[PDB]
Design a protein around this motif. Structure first.
Motif, short mmCIF file in Angstrom:
data_model
loop_
_atom_site.label_atom_id
_atom_site.label_comp_id
_atom_site.label_asym_id
_atom_site.label_seq_id
_atom_site.Cartn_x
_atom_site.Cartn_y
_atom_site.Cartn_z
N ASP A 515 40.57 10.94 -10.80
CA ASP A 515 39.30 10.21 -10.42
C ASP A 515 39.79 9.01 -10.03
O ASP A 515 38.94 7.92 -10.02
CB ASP A 515 38.34 10.21 -11.94
N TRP A 516 40.98 8.76 -9.76
CA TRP A 516 41.64 7.75 -8.74
C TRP A 516 41.74 7.99 -7.20
O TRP A 516 42.27 8.85 -7.11
CB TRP A 516 43.00 7.19 -9.55
N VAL A 517 41.10 6.97 -6.54
CA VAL A 517 41.19 7.20 -5.08
C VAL A 517 42.28 6.26 -4.69
O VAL A 517 42.60 5.06 -5.28
CB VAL A 517 39.78 6.81 -4.54
N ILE A 518 43.05 6.70 -3.72
CA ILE A 518 44.22 5.95 -3.00
C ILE A 518 43.92 5.66 -1.58
O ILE A 518 43.96 6.73 -0.89
CB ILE A 518 45.61 6.66 -3.32
N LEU A 519 43.85 4.46 -1.22
CA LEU A 519 43.54 4.11 0.28
C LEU A 519 44.85 3.64 0.82
O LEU A 519 46.16 3.62 0.41
CB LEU A 519 42.73 2.91 0.28
N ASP A 520 44.89 3.56 2.27
CA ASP A 520 45.91 3.18 2.98
C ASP A 520 45.83 1.48 3.02
O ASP A 520 46.88 1.07 3.53
CB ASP A 520 45.79 3.55 4.61
N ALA A 521 44.69 1.02 2.68
CA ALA A 521 44.79 -0.50 2.91
C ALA A 521 43.46 -0.99 2.13
O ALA A 521 42.56 0.01 1.96
CB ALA A 521 44.33 -0.84 4.37
N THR A 522 43.54 -2.02 1.25
CA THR A 522 42.50 -2.43 0.49
C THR A 522 42.34 -3.83 0.23
O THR A 522 43.34 -4.36 0.08
CB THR A 522 42.50 -1.51 -0.82
N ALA A 523 40.98 -4.39 0.24
CA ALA A 523 40.95 -5.94 -0.35
C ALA A 523 40.54 -5.82 -1.78
O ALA A 523 40.31 -6.87 -2.22
CB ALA A 523 39.87 -6.40 0.52
N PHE A 524 40.81 -4.66 -2.58
CA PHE A 524 40.38 -4.59 -3.97
C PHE A 524 41.63 -5.02 -4.70
O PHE A 524 42.70 -4.57 -4.69
CB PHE A 524 40.15 -3.22 -4.49
N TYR A 525 41.66 -6.22 -5.37
CA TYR A 525 42.57 -6.83 -6.36
C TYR A 525 43.03 -5.83 -7.59
O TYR A 525 42.23 -5.61 -8.53
CB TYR A 525 42.31 -8.11 -6.92
N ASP A 534 39.39 -6.37 -9.40
CA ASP A 534 38.39 -6.62 -8.74
C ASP A 534 37.50 -5.34 -9.25
O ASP A 534 37.98 -4.34 -9.44
CB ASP A 534 38.34 -6.70 -7.17
N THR A 535 36.16 -5.25 -9.14
CA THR A 535 35.39 -4.38 -8.91
C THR A 535 34.65 -4.28 -7.59
O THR A 535 34.94 -5.19 -6.62
CB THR A 535 34.09 -4.13 -10.03
N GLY A 536 33.49 -3.27 -7.34
CA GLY A 536 32.82 -3.39 -6.22
C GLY A 536 32.45 -1.95 -5.92
O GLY A 536 32.42 -0.81 -6.81
N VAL A 537 32.14 -1.56 -4.65
CA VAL A 537 32.01 -0.12 -4.22
C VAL A 537 32.81 0.38 -3.04
O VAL A 537 33.45 -0.45 -2.37
CB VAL A 537 30.32 -0.15 -3.99
N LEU A 538 32.85 1.75 -2.89
CA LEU A 538 33.28 2.31 -1.63
C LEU A 538 32.36 3.22 -1.16
O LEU A 538 31.51 3.93 -1.73
CB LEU A 538 34.67 3.33 -2.03
N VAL A 545 29.54 4.59 -4.13
CA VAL A 545 30.32 4.95 -5.60
C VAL A 545 31.00 3.80 -5.79
O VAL A 545 32.28 3.43 -5.47
CB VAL A 545 31.22 6.02 -5.38
N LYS A 546 30.78 2.97 -7.23
CA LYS A 546 31.33 2.36 -7.85
C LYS A 546 32.70 2.23 -8.11
O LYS A 546 33.03 3.42 -8.39
CB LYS A 546 30.47 1.85 -9.11
N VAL A 547 33.27 1.08 -8.12
CA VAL A 547 34.90 0.92 -8.38
C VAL A 547 34.94 0.43 -9.72
O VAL A 547 34.31 -1.03 -9.74
CB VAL A 547 35.67 0.25 -7.35
N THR A 548 35.29 0.97 -10.52
CA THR A 548 35.22 0.35 -12.06
C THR A 548 36.43 -0.32 -12.71
O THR A 548 36.77 -0.87 -13.70
CB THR A 548 34.66 1.01 -13.14
N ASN A 549 37.70 -0.11 -12.06
CA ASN A 549 38.98 -0.37 -12.32
C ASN A 549 40.00 -0.22 -11.08
O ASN A 549 39.42 0.37 -10.35
CB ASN A 549 39.37 0.75 -13.24
N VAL A 550 40.99 -1.05 -10.96
CA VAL A 550 41.75 -1.13 -9.88
C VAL A 550 43.22 -1.56 -10.36
O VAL A 550 43.66 -2.64 -10.71
CB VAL A 550 41.53 -2.12 -8.62
N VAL A 561 36.94 5.25 -9.21
CA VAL A 561 35.66 5.38 -8.94
C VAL A 561 34.99 6.47 -9.92
O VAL A 561 35.43 7.36 -10.67
CB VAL A 561 35.71 6.02 -7.61
N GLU A 562 33.44 6.28 -9.80
CA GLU A 562 32.71 7.18 -10.76
C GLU A 562 32.34 8.49 -10.24
O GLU A 562 31.90 9.30 -11.02
CB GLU A 562 31.32 6.42 -10.95
N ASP A 563 32.70 8.74 -8.95
CA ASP A 563 32.49 10.06 -8.57
C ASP A 563 33.68 10.50 -7.60
O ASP A 563 33.49 10.26 -6.16
CB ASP A 563 30.98 9.93 -7.57
#
Ligand SMILES: [Zn+2]
Ligand SMILES: [Zn+2]
Length: 728
Positions: A515-525, A534-538, A545-550, A561-563
């Motif tokens: 349930d962890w998504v991995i990006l090539d680039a992120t502004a999520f701390y 940070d939290t937020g959405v993708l 889809v909410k981000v709840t942990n990073v 992410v939640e989904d």
């Protein structure tokens, strides 16, 4: 197994020999020498006969050594400012014990450049394992300067090695100090050192080991290192002693304190002979502990021609004064360099020295506060260590507090132990084992002399071990979310480092694990450095889809992410950070830095982070400090912090290669402890504070807003906590 031929030995006709006593191999110019030059194979020959033709002071010798290597015509070395005795650059040792420790792990692994290659240094080093020998053998110190030239031979880039190292040593000894060449030996003595090992020489002169030459080239047969490191060590104190010929090394280095203490204690000045013979035999005869102080004492008794009782009567006062002198010097470096007495780590060692020293003064029958003795050290040494003058008020205050708090510890401690001795006594015990004497110190703060007169006073045994203190010393050294399925992925581009006001971005999905998504680039701390994630959405396929942990694993960040079924490898997503949560952390994090510059200035330079945590509503900073912060100081700090906000100073960041950063900014960088990487990220508040830091900061202090300090609390001896709140 070990080689040790050198060009010098071959060209100058040195002879390799097996010692007749120890069997070990050594090189010599003396066709008649049969023994290695090392006690008990040989004996100190320099007491009353300095083997260096002229008398030297510490200052004279230090400079002499540093100059010779700095100005060398074939191999000049860069001169390097000594490091604190408190290793800020690593977390695996309590105190610097040796010049090489300045350069582990990062310089040796190649991950940090040397300050200079090759380099020359004079490093105050502390060793607690010898402690029970201090003042007893005539040559052991807690605190001593290790002089060293070092060379770091990285693959492809030779500097110099064994041939040159022994030429350099021999040059320094024979051309600069005018020591007799046919009296020097190089004894082969392989070295093992925890992590790594290599062939080594001990340089011996008139029975004294004046230098250690170590060639590191194996790491944990064993396994060959890539970098070959020249690791020398010349004892400043031993070298000074070799030029004075005094009955002990203490009279040659600590005169400015030994003598004052003799006068005050008003002590019957000994037959000089006895002191000379003690040191002589103490060489021949190590305290390998067991129970051999008593055999050393018996031995010097027979040689001087007296009983051990009259011996003990005559030497003890000297033993006490030598130990007080040594221990107080060591406490000056330790406190200056930032040790706060406590029950943990180097605090615990400082406390141990303080208490040991106070008891020696009381055994002398001297009524003089310990701080006065530290003051002598500050007076003699601030010329060559200005920091002692700068820290003087804090050092002396810390000593006085410890002295004052020791007097209470003792009354209540005496009562408490006496009661638990009587418990053991009606439990059929009439001894008291090592372990429990240790615990008496460890939890009631009583030293074994005190325990014993309490004990024998209701039919229980004193048996103070010869090695008690080096024991107690050992105590100071107490004691995954997602793995490996990442290693094959590129480092995440940290957009929040490029622009910490980026609130939206675009990126590509690299992996979806569980349930962890991995990006090539992120502004999520990603969580770290006391800053929550940070939290937020993708956004994907027009689906939020909410981000709840990073979190961060190595250099790859994972988004909870939640989904997870909404995302697949190769998918392009739209990131959107929760700006409120981020802005409140930025304020608290930069606030924490504004705070630290205020704390340092109002409380003192010994102020070091010990813990840090921030949320959207408050922050806390834990610091090493030696007393409660007063209501008035609270307001003084809050004012000063608020002045820096109102002033709106620039907050800037850059990456620097580790040794560059350290050399420009000093070791204050390492607040949250220590960060890997060839390069580190330095956050700077202009003329205010500078820190190796990972979090997101505001460009300016003005953006922090009002800073309200909520309250203060003690966490444990040596740690105070401050809670504050930022923003309007
Ligand atoms: Zn030998
Ligand atoms: Zn920080």
């Amino acid at each position: 197994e070990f080689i040790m031929k050198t060009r010098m030995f071959e060209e100058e006709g040195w002879i390799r020999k097996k010692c007749k006593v120890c069997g070990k191999p050594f090189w010599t110019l003396d066709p008649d020498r049969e023994t290695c030059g090392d006690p008990p194979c040989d004996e100190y020959q320099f007491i009353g006969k300095p083997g260096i033709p002229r008398k030297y002071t510490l200052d004279e010798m230090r400079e002499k050594f540093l100059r010779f290597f700095e100005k060398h015509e074939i191999y000049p070395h860069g001169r390097v400012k000594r490091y604190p005795v408190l290793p800020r650059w690593r977390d695996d040792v309590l105190l610097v014990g040796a010049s090489i420790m300045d350069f582990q792990p990062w310089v040796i692994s190649g991950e940090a450049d040397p300050p200079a290659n090759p380099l020359v240094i004079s490093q105050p080093s502390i060793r607690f394992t010898d402690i029970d020998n201090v003042g007893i053998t005539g040559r052991h110190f807690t605190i001593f300067e290790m002089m060293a030239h070092h060379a770091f031979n990285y693959p492809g880039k030779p500097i110099y090695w064994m041939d040159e190292t022994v030429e350099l040593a021999f040059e320094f000894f024979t051309k600069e100090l005018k020591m007799k060449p046919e009296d020097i030996t190089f004894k082969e003595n392989p070295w093992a050192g925890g992590g790594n090992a290599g062939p080594a020489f001990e340089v011996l002169y008139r029975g004294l080991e004046v230098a250690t030459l170590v060639f590191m080239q194996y790491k944990k047969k064993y396994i060959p290192m890539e970098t070959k490191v020249v690791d020398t060590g010349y004892g400043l104190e031993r070298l000074v002693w070799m030029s004075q010929g005094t009955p002990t090394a203490y009279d040659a280095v600590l005169g400015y304190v030994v003598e004052p203490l003799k006068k005050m204690a008003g002590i019957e000045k000994i037959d000089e002979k006895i002191l000379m013979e003690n040191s002589r035999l103490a060489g021949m005869f190590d305290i390998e502990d067991l129970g051999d102080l008593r055999y050393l004492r018996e031995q010097v008794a027979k040689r001087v021609g007296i009983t051990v009782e009259e011996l003990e009567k005559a030497i003890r006062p000297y033993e006490l004064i030598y130990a007080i002198a040594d221990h107080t010097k060591a406490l000056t470096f330790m406190l200056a360099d930032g040790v706060v007495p406590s029950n943990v780590k180097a605090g615990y060692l400082a406390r141990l020295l303080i208490r040991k020293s106070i008891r020696h003064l009381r055994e002398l029958g001297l009524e003089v506060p310990l701080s006065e003795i530290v003051a002598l050290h500050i007076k003699e040494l601030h010329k060559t260590f200005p920091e002692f003058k700068e820290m003087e008020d804090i050092i002396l205050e810390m000593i006085e507090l410890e002295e004052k708090k020791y007097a209470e510890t003792l009354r209540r401690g005496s009562d408490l132990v006496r009661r638990e001795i009587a418990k053991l006594k009606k439990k059929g015990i009439k001894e008291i084992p090592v372990e429990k004497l240790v615990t008496f110190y460890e939890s009631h703060g009583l030293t074994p002399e005190i325990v014993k007169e309490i004990a024998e006073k209701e039919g229980v045994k004193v048996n103070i071990p010869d090695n008690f203190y080096s024991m107690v010393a050992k105590e100071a050294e107490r004691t995954l979310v997602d793995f490996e399925l990442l290693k094959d992925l590129p480092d995440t581009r940290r957009l929040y480092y490029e622009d910490p006001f980026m609130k939206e971005f675009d990126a590509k999905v690299l992996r979806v694990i569980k349930d962890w998504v991995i990006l090539d680039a992120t502004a999520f701390y990603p969580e770290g450095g006391g800053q929550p994630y940070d939290t937020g959405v993708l956004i994907v396929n027009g689906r939020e889809v909410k981000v709840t942990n990073v979190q961060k694993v190595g250099k790859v960040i994972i988004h909870k992410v939640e989904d997870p079924g909404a995302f697949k490898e190769g998918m392009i997503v739209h990131g959107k950070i929760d700006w409120k949560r981020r802005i409140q952390h930025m304020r608290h994090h930069t606030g924490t830095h504004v705070l630290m510059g205020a704390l340092v200035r109002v409380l003192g330079r010994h102020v070091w982070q010990a813990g840090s945590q921030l949320t959207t509503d408050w922050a806390r900073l834990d610091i090493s400090h030696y007393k409660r912060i007063s209501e008035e100081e609270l307001k003084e700090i809050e004012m000063l912090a608020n002045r820096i906000v109102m002033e709106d100073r620039k907050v800037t960041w850059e990456w620097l290669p580790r040794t560059t950063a350290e050399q420009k900014y000093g070791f204050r960088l390492y607040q949250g402890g220590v960060v890997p990487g060839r390069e580190i990220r330095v956050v700077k508040i202009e003329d205010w504070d500078v820190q190796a830091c990972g979090g997101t900061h505001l460009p300016s202090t003005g953006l922090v807003g009002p800073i309200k300090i909520l309250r203060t609390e003690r966490i444990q001896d040596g740690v105070e906590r401050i809670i504050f709140a930022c923003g309007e």
